[PDB]
């Protein structure tokens, strides 16, 4: 047993993975086995979702978080999000399961059978965390791989069938994207938008042309950065700004992943373009707007004048003005007037919601969509009772948007905590006091008194 | 040497579980309180006292099981098994809420036995009895909430039932009927509990992050030996850190640990005083100046007036099922509601 | 070089209060939030929080005391829109729509995040182990949950916690109405965290105070038996361990002071992490357990439980909260 | 002369703590005193 | 607002009597040496 106890390694069993910091072969085994775990969950969870999938029922009523991802890519769906073939879901699941067997074999082999350190076996695969050139080279390889993955998404959108477009004319449909937005003004203006209400930063991307053009830019930028880090050594300011150790690199990745988890939470909660409501259910804003639309339709059919109807407070019961003048839905859903959805945009004119198109141009499919989205709002209990907390036990529903947003907020927060833990520990270990204060050379004893 | 002295020697013998003289009071009473709660939440209904299911046998889960209080018509009856209500019948005694008074009385005497155990072990070991003095605050909470509060009210019915969701009902009842959040004694209790949690976290983190390096292990727990004489962490470094971060810092370890004793104990005692006041319905329900102003001025709104409307909703919507002995029949038109919803 | 002198002063450990770079951000933001909070709590005009032209007065000069006073959250018409002073046409409009709340909470959240960073920074400058900021991340996560994450999930800063005592109680009651937080396991873990934190605080304090070594006479305070900076331990750890091991049993007692103090740090911090996550996950409307009409008799009659009584209380709160703001049957946000 | 006389002390930290306790208690209970 | 009148003097006494008491005990502590 090499480095497999506390006396030789300095780490207890509950920090036992920290014994792998300077064992590149076993660390590679741990990483490859964990990657096998991720791919295993993807495949097994897809097969589990498919085995209980009822294709006529909406996906968001069935507790599905992975089939909507495949369906958004355009695999197995037709117009309106209707499932036309479940076989691509099966293919994705089984290919992930088999690939996870391969990755698990490799992880187990490098973890318990392969060489403990890769430096003697290969200068290419061996590494030292203090060697900044090798770290940037490995980072460059992985940047090229990520750029290729982004270009694979582009290739799916442009050549291999397209993507599901919820904004397609005549309901959502699978559409081939033939003119991606390559203008850097649009792409980096998304990057420079405010994160607050009405702006939404990158969460507010509302068409697939911008999505595909952004992934073209992301793939090219990642490939160029990968070549840049393969061919170049870190500069002096970078060498003086960072801690160069394995725990430090881990803490940097933990902070990045925490930020990405928060962004993914906001993306799945607000965006209905890359998370179409046909698959993930309506957003919270979408469902509130749908309720207002539903009761506007019902009362207009009863003969009410929805433009002049006055609520209890004197604001319009159905229609009011946003603070910048736009005609919006009344009630509490005044907070959600920045919502844009394909079932609502036919009723919008230049000044917001249009009274004449409200009176004359509301189609039965829009009324159906509003009722369906109102009654499948992302509200439910932990034991999956649909509705507000005061609802009785009859509806078994929690929206996949709720599950994804809550789970990834939990993960993002804990990864921020992990970033703080490892960044502090990497700093203390680089300076040499992560094990405690030296009794003979305590720094505060050499400092003057505060008062 | 005398039978009393021999029994004393046996009771104070070193064992895995210390018994002592206090054990005679503690172990039967604590065991019976715990066993009564487990038995009641596993097998015993509340159908005749509250009209509720409250056991696993009826289909409740861990959150919704409770040993419920007796019916309001019992008054403050001790509800002894041999008493005039049950008349020796165990089944009727369970159906009438006798397990509640069983658990409450045996728990009270078990708490007495545990504080006496703290005193006895402190006397034998040779330490000061500050742990028993600190345990006086949970005893004050239990006596004020489970005994004094229902004694001030009409019956045992309005005491908390021994269950998770039943305690949640008790919380919401105190909000709706007593406005217990507005009570300054409850505010002092909250300050004591949250300050105790803060002090616990901050003292633990401060000690763990000002440790001296006393070993080469990267896990520092092995660098402490219980028989060592030196302090395991730097008080000077901790003091300078908190003086520069927060402005003030402890400089006396004994004062720090007494303060850690003092904050949650004082908070719990203040909340117990407030609960005594609520036993007599001496509530901090309302501010009279705000209510005079709101009565004369229909445009004056505060968060306190909104809370009063919420309390009215709680009372009117909760009372027919929470107090079934009153036979409240509130028709739909008398229920206070906002627009829509 | 002026920049080198400024860097030396900022990172100096000889300042009475450490600044650091996190403090370079923290001091102006917390000063701005504090000054605006004091001014708004004393003298702000009423705020139309629900966006229904029904202004709520929260300042002392407009008829409040310390208990009922608050800085009222910004208007529901604003929602999540960024509302600085320069976005308003006048200061009267900014005050009417609850702009001070957005100013205070944004400056406070930035300053408190930089307070956490500053705690790390000073621990690094003093040669300390760095994880006090990790412990402080639990109340900071709680503040982020009630001031930022819950408004984001619900779509309006009007649903953030008001900056006042009675406003806090209003937030709690409406939150229980809409999300059944008492039945949420993360809030139950938080209650276990704070109750256990108070318990273990009282326990550790009483056990250390109980085992203090005699250094003083009966007239003086026992606290004078400890001298600041002394090397010897001021109490007998073995005697406290012997007491607490006889109080329960030997293996429920810490004989290791480092493990004990790690437990004291870890229990309330993890509990408060879980309750802050509970507030955030209920911000995305993943509510507490719903056992309404769970117990059904043989015929099909509903047998009520304590959860049904809780549901009655929640219904009372739900139908009375924001009594003029709802036009439609479902309170969807 | 009574031999049972003892000097009474209250250090500045205790003064600060007691003043904080009194002022915070007054701030808490003043709204209820005014009512 | 129509507040209780004695609520002023009570509050003042609630500050004044304990605080000056502590102040007394502080100042006579400082003059001891």
């Amino acid at each position: 047993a090499t480095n497999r106890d506390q006396e030789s390694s300095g780490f207890a069993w509950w920090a036992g993975n920290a014994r792998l910091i300077n064992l590149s072969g076993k660390l590679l085994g741990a990483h490859v086995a964990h990657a096998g775990l991720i791919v295993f969950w993807a495949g097994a969870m897809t097969l589990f979702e498919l085995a209980h999938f009822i294709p006529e029922k909406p996906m968001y009523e069935q507790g599905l978080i992975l089939i909507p991802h495949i369906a958004t890519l355009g695999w197995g769906v037709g117009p309106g999000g209707e499932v036309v073939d479940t076989f691509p879901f099966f293919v994705v699941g089984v290919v992930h399961l088999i690939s996870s067997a391969v990755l698990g074999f490799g992880g187990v082999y490098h973890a318990i059978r392969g060489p403990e350190t890769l430096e003697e076996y290969s200068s290419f695969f061996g590494y030292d965390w203090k060697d900044k050139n090798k770290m940037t080279t490995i980072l460059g390889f992985h940047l090229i791989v990520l750029g290729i993955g982004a270009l694979l998404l582009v290739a799916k959108a442009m050549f291999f069938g397209g993507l599901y477009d919820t904004w397609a004319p005549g309901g959502g449909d699978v559409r081939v994207i033939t003119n991606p937005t390559l203008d850097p003004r649009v792409i980096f203006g998304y990057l420079l938008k405010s994160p607050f209400g009405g702006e939404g930063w990158i969460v507010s991307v509302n068409n697939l042309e911008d999505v595909v053009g952004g992934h073209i830019w992301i793939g090219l930028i990642c490939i160029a950065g990968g070549i840049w880090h393969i061919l170049t050594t870190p500069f002096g300011w970078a060498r003086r700004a960072f801690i160069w150790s394995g725990e430090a690199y881990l803490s940097y990745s933990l902070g990045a992943l925490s930020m990405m988890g928060f962004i993914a939470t906001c993306f799945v909660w607000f965006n209905n373009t890359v998370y179409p409501s046909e698959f993930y259910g309506p957003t919270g804003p979408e469902a509130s707007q749908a309720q207002a639309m539903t009761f506007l339709i019902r009362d207009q059919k009863l003969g009410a004048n929805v433009g002049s109807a006055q609520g209890p407070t004197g604001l319009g019961k159905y229609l009011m003005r946003s603070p910048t003048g736009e005609i919006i839905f009344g009630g509490e859903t005044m907070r959600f007037w920045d919502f844009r959805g394909p079932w609502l945009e036919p009723l919008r004119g230049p000044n917001g919601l249009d009274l004449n198109k409200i009176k004359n141009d509301i189609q039965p499919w829009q009324e159906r969509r509003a009722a369906e989205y109102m009654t499948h709002a992302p509200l439910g209990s932990l034991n999956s009772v649909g509705g507000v907390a005061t609802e009785i036990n009859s509806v078994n529903f929690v929206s996949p948007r709720s599950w994804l947003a809550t789970s990834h907020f939990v993960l993002a927060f804990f990864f921020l905590v992990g970033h703080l833990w490892h960044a502090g520990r990497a700093r203390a270990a680089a300076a040499g006091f992560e094990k405690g204060i030296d009794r003979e050379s305590e720094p505060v004893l050499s400092m003057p008194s505060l008062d | 040497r005398g039978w009393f002295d021999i029994l004393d020697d046996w009771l104070k013998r070193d064992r895995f579980v210390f018994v002592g003289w206090s054990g005679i009071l503690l172990f039967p009473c604590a065991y019976l309180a715990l066993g009564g709660w487990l038995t009641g939440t596993t097998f015993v209904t509340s159908w005749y006292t509250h009209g509720l299911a409250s056991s696993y046998l009826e289909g409740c889960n861990f959150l919704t099981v409770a040993v419920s209080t007796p019916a309001n018509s019992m008054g403050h009856s001790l509800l002894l098994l041999w008493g005039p209500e049950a008349q020796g019948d165990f089944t009727r005694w369970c159906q009438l809420g006798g397990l509640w008074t069983f658990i409450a009385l045996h728990g009270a005497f078990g708490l007495i036995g545990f504080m006496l155990r703290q005193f006895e072990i402190a006397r034998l070991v040779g330490v000061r009895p500050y742990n028993a003095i600190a345990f006086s605050a949970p005893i004050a909470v239990f006596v004020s909430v489970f005994l004094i509060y229902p004694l001030g009210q009409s019956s045992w019915f309005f005491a908390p039932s021994f269950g998770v969701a039943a305690i949640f009902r008790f919380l919401l009842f105190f909000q709706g009927f007593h406005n217990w959040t507005l009570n300054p004694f409850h505010m002092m209790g909250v300050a004591g509990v949250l300050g105790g949690a803060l002090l616990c976290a901050i003292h633990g983190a401060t000690v763990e992050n000002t440790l001296f390096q006393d070993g080469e292990g990267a896990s520092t727990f092995r660098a402490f030996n219980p028989t060592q004489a030196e302090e395991t962490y730097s008080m000077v470094t901790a003091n300078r850190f908190w003086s520069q971060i927060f402005g003030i810092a402890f400089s006396n370890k004994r004062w720090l640990h007494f303060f850690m004793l003092f904050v949650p104990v004082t908070g719990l005692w203040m909340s117990a005083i407030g609960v005594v006041g609520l036993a007599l319905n001496l509530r901090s329900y309302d501010f009279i100046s705000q209510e005079i102003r709101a009565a004369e001025d229909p445009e004056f709104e505060t968060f306190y007036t909104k809370n009063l409307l919420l309390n009215e909703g709680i009372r009117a919507w909760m009372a027919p099922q929470d107090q079934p002995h009153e036979n409240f029949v509130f028709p739909e038109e008398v229920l206070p509601r906002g627009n829509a919803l | 070089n002026l920049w080198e002198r400024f860097c030396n002063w900022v990172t100096s450990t000889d300042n009475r209060l450490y600044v650091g770079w996190f403090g370079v951000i923290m001091i102006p933001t917390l000063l701005a939030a504090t000054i605006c909070f004091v001014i708004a709590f004393i003298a702000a005009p009423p705020v139309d929080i629900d966006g229904i032209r029904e202004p709520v007065s929260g300042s002392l000069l407009y008829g409040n005391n310390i208990i009922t006073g608050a800085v009222v959250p910004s208007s529901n018409a604003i929602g999540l829109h960024f509302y600085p002073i320069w976005e308003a046409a006048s200061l009267d409009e900014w005050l009417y729509n609850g702009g001070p709340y957005q100013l205070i909470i944004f400056h406070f959240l930035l300053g408190a995040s930089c307070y956490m960073g500053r705690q790390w920074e000073l621990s690094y400058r003093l040669g300390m182990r760095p994880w006090i900021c990790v412990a402080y991340s639990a109340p900071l996560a709680s503040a982020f949950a009630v001031f930022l994450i819950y408004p984001i999930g619900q779509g309006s800063f009007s649903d953030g916690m008001p900056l006042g005592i009675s406003g806090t109680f209003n937030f709690m009651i409406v939150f229980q109405a809409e999300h059944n937080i008492l039945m949420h396991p993360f809030h139950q873990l938080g209650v276990a965290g704070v109750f256990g934190g108070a318990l273990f605080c009282a326990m550790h304090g009483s056990l250390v105070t109980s085992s203090l070594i005699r250094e003083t006479t009966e007239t003086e305070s026992a606290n004078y038996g400890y001298k600041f900076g002394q090397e010897e331990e001021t109490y007998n750890i073995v005697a406290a361990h012997g007491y607490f091991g006889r109080l329960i049993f030997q293996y429920a007692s810490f004989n290791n002071s480092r493990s004990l103090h790690f437990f004291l740090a870890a229990w309330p911090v993890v509990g408060v992490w879980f309750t802050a996550l509970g507030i955030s996950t209920m911000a995305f409307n993943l509510n507490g357990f719903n056992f309404n009409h769970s117990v059904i008799d043989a015929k099909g009659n509903v047998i009520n439980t304590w959860a049904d009584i809780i549901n009655r209380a929640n219904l009372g709160m739900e139908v009375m909260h924001e009594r003029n703001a709802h036009n439609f049957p479902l309170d969807l946000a | 002369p009574n031999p049972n006389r003892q000097p009474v002390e209250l250090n500045r930290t205790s003064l600060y703590l007691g003043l904080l306790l009194i002022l915070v208690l007054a701030l808490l209970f003043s709204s209820y005193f005014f009512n | 607002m129509e507040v209780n009148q004695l609520g002023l003097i009570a509050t003042a006494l609630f500050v004044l009597v304990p605080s000056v008491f502590l102040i007394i005990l502080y100042v006579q502590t400082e003059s001891q040496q």
Binding site: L445, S449, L450, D451 | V236, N239, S243, G247, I248, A249, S251 | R16, L17, I42, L60, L61, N65, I66, K227, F228, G229, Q230 | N11, R12, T13, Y16, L19, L20, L23, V24, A26, L27, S30, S31, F34 | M1, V3, G7, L8, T11, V15
Partner: peptide, 30 residues
């Protein structure tokens, strides 16, 4: 009258904060 009382008590607390931070008993390390 009540507003003046609240602001006075709050200002006394802030003054006490100032004196407790900057005019404390210095921790003299022995």
């Amino acid at each position: 009258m009540e507003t003046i009382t609240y602001v006075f008590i709050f200002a006394c607390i802030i003054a006490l904060f100032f004196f407790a931070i900057f005019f404390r008993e210095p921790p003299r390390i022995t």
